[PDB]
Amino acid sequence: VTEFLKPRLVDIEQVSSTHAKVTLEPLERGFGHTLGNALRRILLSSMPGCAVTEV
Amino acid sequence: FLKPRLVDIEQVSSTHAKVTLEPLERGFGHTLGNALRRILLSSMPGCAVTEVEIDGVLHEYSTKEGVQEDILEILLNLKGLAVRVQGKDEVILTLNKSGIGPVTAADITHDGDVEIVKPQHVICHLTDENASISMRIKVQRGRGYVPASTRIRPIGRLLVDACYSPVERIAYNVEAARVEQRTDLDKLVIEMETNGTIDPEEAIRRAATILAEQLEAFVDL
Amino acid sequence: RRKITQGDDLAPGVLKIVKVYLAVKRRIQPGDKMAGRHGNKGVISKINPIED
Q1: On the CB side of B68, how many CA atoms lie within 13 Å of its CA?
Q2: Interface mutation vs chain B, best among A35, A39, A40, A44, most B CBs within 10 Å
């Protein structure tokens, strides 16, 4: 009742050092979008970086 | 960086309660709200009937004397029955009420592990004093939605579709926190309209866990 | 009772006919045709999860 299929990163293809296409085969029904949406917002707006453009 | 807490868990009503997560930073709050809502609506442990054996009827598509509603109507009423169980996964509940008056979840024999959240809920109506109703309803825990056909012996046992989801309606509101030391912090308030079987704080913590173990895959070994 | 007891008249050359009634609970299936009263007919494209 608490056991859910645990995603395994089957492939982490790197087209370039900059571009990668990680994929997880199992996840759960309606969980791939949840993990994907959560990950997208956290790196896009909350991952810190040291580039202050204003100079 | 800051970490949220369930500072407040208010039970405005038995069915639905509001859960607050105060120490949330900008952006984190909306993400956590959406992810928690999706994981709660999708997969939460819950208790629902899965097999019913009316003593006097063979199949669901039949009537029983002295009962106002159809047997299939009885199964439809029993499908949305508020039941919590702790301990063993599956439990059989026995209902035996005789005489006039509508039967209720309170009429079911009470067992130690299982307590009905909503005794006032109506199953069927006994319209004959002479007539009586006897049944054995089997309740097990599961996740999401399980159609009756997907599951699986004698002709007497009736298979009823199981809706294990305890939460019915979930909404999260993100508003600025009242903290003064550091601005831009936003508290998250999540209201869960539930059948009452699941504890609000426990449900939130369990969903957070399920997200964490699902999220633990992404980090490298 | 005698009307039930007497063998029902049957098509000639048939000793007995057994009429078995099959009852099935058909549910919403992808591709099922659902329409409103105003004529907006459509098939069910996908059984979308509630959270989606």
Answers
A1: 13
A2: A35
Contact residues for B1 (Cβ-Cβ < 8 A; gap 6+)? B25
Q: What distance in Å separates the CA atoms of residue B138 and residue B128, rounded to the nearest whole number?
A: 26
H or E segment and range at residue B8: strand B8-10
Pair B19, B202: CB distance under 8 Å: no
Count how many pairs of residues, chain A against chain C, have C-beta atoms within 8 Å. 6
Q: C50 contacts in B (CB within 8 Å)? A: 41-42
Contact A2 B142 (CB under 8 A): no
Spatial distance between the Cα atoms of B128 and A41, rounded to a whole number of angstroms? 62
Residue pointed to by tokens 């199953």: B123
Instruction: Say whether A45 sits in a helix, a strand or coil.
Output: helix
CA distance B5 to C51: 24
Of chain A, the end-to-end C-alpha distance in Å amounts to 56
Q: Which residue is listed with tokens 């029983």?
A: B64
Strand partners, B133: B97
Query: What are the φ/ψ torsions at residue B34 (nearest 5 degrees)?
Result: -65, -45
This PDB structure is determined at a resolution in Å of 3.8
Q: Are strands B114-116 and B8-10 parallel, antiparallel or unpaired?
A: unpaired
Tell me the shortest Cα–Cα distance from B31 to chain A, in angstroms: 6
State the amino acid at position B74 in one-letter form: I
**Other C-beta atoms lying within 10 Å of the C-beta of residue C25:** 11
Quote the tokens at residue C52.
């989606």
The alpha-helical segments, DSSP class H, found in chain B are: 28-42, 71-79, 200-216
Show the tokens assigned to B202. Answer: 């426990």
What count of other Cβ atoms lies within 10 Å of the Cβ of residue B151? 14
Q: Are residues B174 and B33 in contact, defined by beta-carbon separation less than 8 angstroms? A: yes
Which CATH code fits B45-163? 2.170.120.12
Tokens of B176: 């600025």
| H runs (alpha helix) in chain A | 32-41
